[PDB]
Design a protein around this ligand. Structure first.
Ligand SMILES: Nc1ncnc2c1ncn2[C@@H]1O[C@H](COP(=O)(O)OP(=O)(O)O)[C@@H](O)[C@H]1O
Ligand SMILES: Nc1ncnc2c1ncn2[C@@H]1O[C@H](COP(=O)(O)OP(=O)(O)O)[C@@H](O)[C@H]1O
Ligand SMILES: Nc1ncnc2c1ncn2[C@@H]1O[C@H](COP(=O)(O)OP(=O)(O)O)[C@@H](O)[C@H]1O
Ligand SMILES: Cc1ncc(C[n+]2csc(CCOP(=O)(O)OP(=O)(O)O)c2C)c(N)n1
Ligand SMILES: Cc1ncc(C[n+]2csc(CCOP(=O)(O)OP(=O)(O)O)c2C)c(N)n1
Ligand SMILES: Cc1ncc(C[n+]2csc(CCOP(=O)(O)OP(=O)(O)O)c2C)c(N)n1
Ligand SMILES: [Mg+2]
Ligand SMILES: [Mg+2]
Ligand SMILES: [Mg+2]
Lengths: 543, 542, 543
């Protein structure tokens, strides 16, 4: 009789499902699950809070293309990751949250951390089940991987009773499950593909919009071939920057407000008409704007704005279908058209207004001058993590991306507390790749001590914090008042000394020449670092 | 005269007795905090929603009414689910005010539009979304009502973003009267007489004092009950202080002895949960008789049959119990071998703990580092203890003398409440020292919140025990390729982290340095952190 | 080794907890639970739908004073009783819903009737747990009885996996639990009791209101002693009729709208200021009305109207406290007061306006003439079940009750589909007692075939149906139109022939003389019967 306990079955089933990384904080009763995960070949990363650990999991999934894993303590441990769990649902990102629970033999006794935690994750989960039998653990894991990756992706939660985790059983009595296949791709209806190309030919002022769904579909080659073979100006969403290099000739990112107001037809590829795109409604949009939609979630069609031609199914497959229809006709939107001309004139004018602020040298620095140094020195093959308000917002314009899936921001949920998790998760998915984590001072405080994880594991992560006074730029005079500012934080805080105390490199760049040197020094360091950037609390946030 | 929703919320809270609000502002709740300050509510801006909600629980437990937390829509509200549940686990009232999508933007994909109401229902005494702007004082008064009355617990109030900023004539607003404080209920006189009749027949009785006595404000009656009867009493972790821990009838030094040999147990304001080992063997005798006093009738007879059960306010019931004792004048014998054997096991176990407190080593141990804290902890200071052995051993070494002066993980064993409890305790008691003892694993959950104590200049002194992470980890464990799953940087300088945020820093590598570090930080008119590198192989047991 | 299966442990634990009756529809996997219940001493009643079976359980609890039990099939069986489960929550009535579920070995396989049914009952349940271990079944049952009876009473749901129900185990390994005690009574704060009597002495035009909470507290003797020793006119709620005999000299039931508008102070004993009492707000109430409240749920105080003196705790104990304060002073509200005089004059005038309609003889009958015969011939020791709209509403005025807990209506939830369940449940709790189930034709259709249960078990239940045209009185001309009436039902339906086909006695009373004879004939029958009463579709519903 060769025996095996529950925690080994969990870890072994995860490894058989292609899981390579796991994050979380150990404790009762999940400590052995992490120990078994390291023995089974899954690298464990001990975080300091369950919230960024869950964000690290979904980052590994989005970047790696398979599934990331988070481990949480029963009771308050699992419930501390509800927001990060919902963020994976808002962005349609798969993951697996593994959490302990009360022992079956201690149900209704007042057991340690005994609580109803299934109901808190169910409003956002593709899969939320409590293990009922020890010999069926691989089935629960296979079903968790299946519901999270297939269909519309989303987070999965697998609850494990405390007594099942430590219980042993003969190995031959364990019902193992085969590897859940990777998501399959569907072609769109050829009648809808022919109608989509037909509607584009009749468009007077068209505009292509590329969303993060194209990134998840790994359709960077096809979306560029479509944008280039049609000659239509495109507009990349925040996390779609990089699929097509942001310096492309047809990029309307500098004329975003212009192309969204004057477009008579819009090709919405892998994006949603949500708050990010102003719901496609006036005043930001043309009242009679036509919509061609490509989204493999059929429930997203015609939301807010009616869809003239809807194409559900895989973006990469449908883009290849649309290209074959284009190759049949050899069609091309006129290059000399005043639409491309008026968009180019609007883009260059707005780009020069941004160029004016970027060349403005100040001490303390401003948004555009500080972000200019990052854009100049960001490795094009690095991963850029941005979190905050205007710090994250303006970085969308200044910081260009040139490679697919190299930028991570707050996403469709606008969440705070994911910067450290995404950076730690990105560095774990790509061992040697450099990670730049730009954050505001307000965003940094949600998980500030997580920098120690980058020291304990020696991760090449470079943090850059804009201390402008907290949630918004608060002048020093506001803190002298009796009632301290509501969104104000210590203007004189030295987050580099915070990183220094945790065991990492420290930099306090107060001008452009100091920020230039502090960045290139942090890049050459084979480890973590934080560059404190005291920001002007009155810095202009518009060009 | 017009008024918007955010002002109505703040004015209603002020009318209900709310005096503090901890939150992280943002769309669409930023104006609520500003209105809270204009209506006379101290708003303490935090850096994360989880410690902000834990701070609201501390204000309620210490203040006696209701603390308030303000959360951003979507991720903000869902960042405090564990803290919201911790208030339910400890039966503590509070109010989590959260924004949400606008009513005009429902089913559009609005910013942070999500079902956050369902995530808090499993633990909420009240979870409702505002539907009418003019009815906000009704929603607030009903949130205060459900949280305080009955078995206390948290309440969640969801507010649509458009209602927060929508204006209306003030005369068209339905203001609600001040919700009264919870009423008291008397116990059945027949049950009270049987409880006294059961104590007389007990040969080895034991009183167990729980945090319900603290919530009941019954510290005067529970001490008058232990002395009138002469039974050795035992206080739960957060019950330390109701009766001063140096009482001549405290069986804390022989806890395992009294729980394993008592023939009868008087359960006051405590539950037979994991903390009390469910009242079951081997920690307890299988034939132990239970006399229970808990105003939640659903808690009687749990795990172990309750012989005589008394529901009703502990303070009022203890008055009945004393009134029945004042007739016969009965008292347990002083020379009884049960009290003598308890004193024999107690004075012996205390010597074993005292022996470990005399061992000076470099780095410091648990008992040596906790000895310097107990010698200098002022009796009228709020002591916050978070972690594993750091908190567990502090229940033994650190002494409490005033009622409701210790805050720990509670019945939920939650991690991430240390900073919030300390910031909430300092906000509740302005001119009062606060000591936040944390392990290095517990500190990382919300370490950046020390800047809040720097921003508001709170008299909070953090003390961190860096022993290698979640448990003691030798430096040799970090040299392997696979890093330890519960390990954290042994060389981490959390005092330099505090210095970077704007607070006083201290590093105590021995007992003499810790003695000077504590006495110095206690005289600082602001926050401070004492980093105590601990022996990764320190003695956990006496 | 003396073995025992799961279904026997459930039934034996229920019998040890004082459970005597069980209702429901058998099937997979709960059939053996009913068979074991009959062998363990619990009488099983096979219903035809899970909705009235659950209503029968809460009726047994309210009438018996302990706990009634309902048994439901997994999946759609349990989910068919969600409304009846919520009704027990709306009325603060205890019960236990026992339902099967998917086997643990078949979780996540698509098992027969596999579904998440815990989440549907949790918004209303005091206890909703799925059994996780076989040897701990008595603990689940003891905890279900405990949370349902103690504190604020309410429904409890106990889910049982299919494989645990049939699984056997050594009897010595079964962890049995002792009997959960009956609810304990609490005295109110003597400071609040002294203030309540103090406020009543200052009342100029007081009014006592007796709710069904006094019935649950079994305080019929104390509430009468208080109403009589204070001399204050009282007002009994619909299901509070009978605690004090409805022909009492101080009953203001005939002047309800008058006493609620002119009362300067109201003693709310065991009742809630909900929709039934017009929320205590104008125009139905005095704007500055003072409120003295007696409700052992502290969360109900000051709702809608502020409470001047609140007294939580047991009603019977608090009423005994208030009586001792009255006996100390010998206080009495003036009998000669114009308040008692104006209420008496208003009551006799309204009673005579009702007397006019009751003496009106018509064919088809009207509401007041048909209900007059029921009031004349209703046994004062029988149980009167009323369900419907005006049929149930007007019966509150015409049909008097003289004994505590003899009337059951729709309750605080206004639910339909409880008439048959309450009648069947009442006849099961009291074996030989006669039950009169008055219903409208619309109410009768929710569970019409349930009359067969009264035939199969030979229950002394007399059904009386008012066929007035459906949900409201619809004339025969309305059904001749193209669009059939929205709330209209067959005016010519013969529900007595429906009962006759099911095996019971039948009567079709079309006038007063026929209704008088049909009632007294149905009373002498040692079994079920239905009296069809074709009602005037234009019958006056107001005096
Ligand atoms: N592989 C895929 N093929 C096609 N569509 C996809 C794929 N993956 C995701 N999507 C779609 O992309 C959409 C994501 O849009 P969203 O992330 O809101 O846009 P944005 O990039 O502006 O945030 C989802 O609705 C999803 O249905
Ligand atoms: N005023 C009161 N009177 C009686 N019991 C109370 C009162 N307030 C709270 N309680 C009870 O005290 C119990 C708290 O138990 P618990 O917190 O587990 O004890 P501890 O944590 O101190 O061991 C709750 O079940 C609650 O019902
Ligand atoms: N034994 C009892 N002692 C005191 N109050 C009780 C008791 N049982 C129930 N109640 C109270 O009576 C109230 C029921 O009122 P309700 O049924 O709405 O009034 P009505 O009779 O008008 O329907 C509940 O709020 C409950 O708290
Ligand atoms: C969990 C969570 N809490 C709160 C918010 C609200 N929020 C959005 S951005 C932000 C902080 C913005 O400040 P910072 O990062 O310093 O940016 P800057 O002042 O440089 O623009 C906050 C609190 C959120 N999105 N998520
Ligand atoms: C929210 C939450 N996550 C995780 C845990 C599990 N847990 C219990 S104690 C602890 C930390 C113990 O470390 P530390 O405070 O350094 O203690 P020490 O080394 O002194 O024993 C953790 C993570 C918890 N109780 N709550
Ligand atoms: C489950 C449920 N469905 C519907 C209703 C709405 N409802 C209230 S009374 C009633 C029927 C009233 O008709 P009837 O009993 O014939 O009375 P009458 O016309 O004699 O007044 C209905 C459908 C309800 N209360 N509960
Ligand atoms: Mg900032
Ligand atoms: Mg530690
Ligand atoms: Mg009808």
């Amino acid at each position: 009789v060769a025996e095996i306990d529950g925690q080994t079955i969990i870890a072994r089933a995860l490894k058989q499902q292609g899981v390579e990384a796991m994050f979380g904080v150990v404790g009762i009763p999940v400590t052995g699950i992490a120990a078994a995960a390291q023995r089974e070949g899954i690298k464990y990363v001990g975080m300091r809070h369950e919230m960024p650990a869950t964000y690290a999991a979904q980052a590994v999934s989005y970047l790696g293309g398979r599934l990331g894993t988070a481990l949480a303590v029963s009771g308050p441990g699992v419930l501390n990751a509800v927001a990060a769990f919902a963020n994976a649902w808002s962005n349609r990102w798969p993951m697996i949250l593994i959490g302990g629970s009360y022992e079956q033999t201690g149900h209704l006794m007042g057991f340690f951390q005994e609580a109803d935690q299934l109901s808190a994750l169910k409003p956002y989960a593709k899969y939320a089940e409590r293990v009922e039998r020890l010999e069926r653990i691989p089935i629960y894991v296979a079903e968790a991987v299946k519901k999270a990756l297939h269909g519309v992706p989303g987070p999965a939660y697998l609850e494990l009773p405390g007594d099942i985790i430590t219980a042993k059983i003969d190995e031959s009595k364990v019902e193992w499950a085969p590897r859940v296949p990777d998501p399959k791709r569907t072609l769109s209806d050829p009648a809808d593909v022919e109608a989509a190309i037909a509607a584009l030919k009749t468009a007077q002022q068209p505009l292509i919009i590329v969303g993060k769904g194209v990134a998840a579909s790994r359709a960077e080659v096809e979306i560029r071939a479509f944008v280039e073979k049609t000659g239509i100006p495109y507009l990349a969403m925040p996390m779609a920057k990089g699929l097509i290099p942001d310096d492309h000739d047809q990029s309307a990112a500098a004329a975003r407000s212009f192309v969204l107001q004057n477009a008579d037809l819009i090709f919405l590829v892998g994006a949603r008409l949500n708050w990010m795109l102003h719901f496609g409604l006036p005043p930001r949009f043309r009242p009679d704007v036509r919509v061609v939609q490509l989204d493999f979630n059929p429930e997203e069609i015609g939301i807010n704005v009616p869809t003239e031609v809807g194409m559900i199914g895989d973006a990469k497959a449908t883009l290849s279908q649309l290209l074959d229809v284009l190759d049949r006709d050899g069609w091309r939107f006129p290059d000399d058209s005043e639409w491309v001309t008026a968009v180019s004139a609007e883009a260059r004018q707005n780009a020069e207004a941004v160029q004016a602020m970027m060349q403005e040298d100040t001490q303390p620095l401003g948004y555009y001058r500080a972000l200019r140094s990052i854009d100049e020195r960001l490795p094009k093959d690095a991963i850029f993590v941005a979190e905050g308000a205007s710090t994250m917002d303006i970085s969308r314009t200044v910081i260009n991306q040139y490679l697919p899936r190299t930028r991570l921001d707050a996403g469709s949920f606008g969440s705070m507390g994911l910067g450290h998790g995404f950076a730690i998760g990105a560095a774990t998915q790509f061992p040697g790749k450099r990670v730049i984590c730009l954050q505001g001072d307000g965003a940094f405080g949600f998980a500030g001590t997580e920098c120690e994880v980058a020291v304990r594991y020696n991760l090449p992560i470079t943090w850059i914090v804009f201390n402008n006074g907290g949630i918004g730029g608060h002048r020093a005079e506001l803190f002298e008042r009796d009632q301290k500012p509501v969104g104000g934080m210590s203007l004189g805080a030295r987050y580099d000394i915070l990183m220094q105390g945790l065991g990492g490199a420290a930099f306090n760049a107060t001008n452009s020449d100091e920020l230039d040197a502090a960045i290139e020094a942090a890049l050459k360091i084979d480890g973590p670092s934080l560059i404190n950037v005291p920001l002007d609390p009155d810095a202009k946030r518009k060009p």
